[PDB]
Amino acid sequence: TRYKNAKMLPF
Amino acid sequence: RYKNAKMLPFAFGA
Amino acid sequence: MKVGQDKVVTIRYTLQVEGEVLDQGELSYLHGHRNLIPGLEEALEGREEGEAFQAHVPAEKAYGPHDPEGVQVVPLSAFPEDAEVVPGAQFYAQDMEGNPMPLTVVAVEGEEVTVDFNHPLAGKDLDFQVEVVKVREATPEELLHGHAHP
C-alpha cells in the first residue's frame, strides 16, 4: 500500500 | 496485508 | 515416517500454472509452522517418504488473490540512481513501521514508475507434481527458530 518516502533498494 | 506473501515454495522478499 | 507436525520435510516439485511450467526445484520446510502455502501443506499431511502425487492449489490457499489497490505509482526519484527500472525488476520498499515491502515494477513512463506489491502468483491457481524425498523429526534449534536449518 502507501510507502514511506524512502529510497527503494534492489533484490 | 498480503498474508501469504513470504511463504515457500516461492517466497516474495526477505 | 509420515509428514506431520514438527517434521522437517524435504520434497522435489515442479509447478504448473495454466498448463505451462514456471519453476521446478527442491526444498525443505518445517511442517506446521506456516512456512509452506496452506494448500500444499494440507496436501502433504499424512504422506509417507517416497510418495508422489499431483496437487491443485487454488489462489485462496496459495499466495492469495490479486489486490487492485496493490498497484500505485512512485517517482523514479526513489530508485537508486545506479539501479535500472525495467519491467520485471524487483526492489524493496519500506513501510511506516520500516518493515520491508517487496515490489515488482510493471512499467516505466518517464518520471512515473508503476509497481505491484502483490505476490507474483496472486490470483493464480497452482498445479504441483510433488514427490516427498525425505521426512525427519526436527531438531530443537529448528523448533526454536521456527524454520528448518538449510
Author numbering:
A (entry chain C): 1 to 11
B (entry chain B): 2 to 15
C (entry chain A): 1 to 150
From the paper:
Peptidyl-prolyl isomerases (PPIases) catalyze intrinsically slow and often rate-limiting isomerization of prolyl-peptide bonds in unfolded or partially folded proteins, thereby speeding up the folding process and preventing misfolding. An example of such a protein is SlyD (Sensitive to Lysis D), which consists of an FKBP type PPIase domain and a chaperone domain, called IF (insert-in-flap) domain, that has been shown to exhibit chaperone activity. Each of these domains contains one binding site for unfolded proteins or peptides. Often, FKBPs are linked to an additional chaperone domain that can increase their PPIase activity by up to 200-fold.
In order to further explore the contribution of the aromatic residues W4 and F13 of the peptide substrate on the SlyD activity, we changed them individually to negatively charged glutamate (W4E, F13E) or positively charged lysine (W4K, F13K) residues. SlyDWT is less active on peptides with lysine residues in position 4 and 13, similar to the alanine mutants, while the activity towards glutamate variants is increased or unchanged. Similarly, the peptides with positively charged lysine residues at positions 4 (W4K) and 13 (F13K) also displayed only modest changes in their affinities compared to the psWT peptide. Although most of the protein–peptide complexes did not crystallize or yielded crystals of poor diffraction quality, we succeeded in structure determination for four complexes of SlyDWT with bound substrates: psWT, W4A, W4K, and M8A. In all structures, the peptide substrates are bound in the PPIase binding pocket with the proline residue in cis conformation, coordinated by the previously observed protein–peptide polar interactions, namely N35-L9, I37-L9, Y63-F11, H119-F11 and Y92-F13. On the other hand, the conformational flexibility of the residue i − 6 is also reflected in our crystal structures.While residue W4 of the original S2 peptide forms a polar interaction with the SlyD residue E60, orienting the N-terminus of the peptide outside of the binding pocket, mutant peptide residues A4 and K4 do not form this interaction and as a result, the peptide N-terminus bends towards the SlyD linker region. Taken together, while different side chains at position 4 assume distinct conformations in each substrate variant, these conformations proof to be unspecific when compared to the structure of other variants. This resembles encounter complexes where initial contacts are unspecific and contribute to the association reaction, but not to the dissociation step where they are replaced by specific contacts. When both binding sites are fully occupied, the two domains restrict access to the PPIase domain binding site in the tight conformation. Here, the release of the substrate from the FKBP binding site is likely hindered.
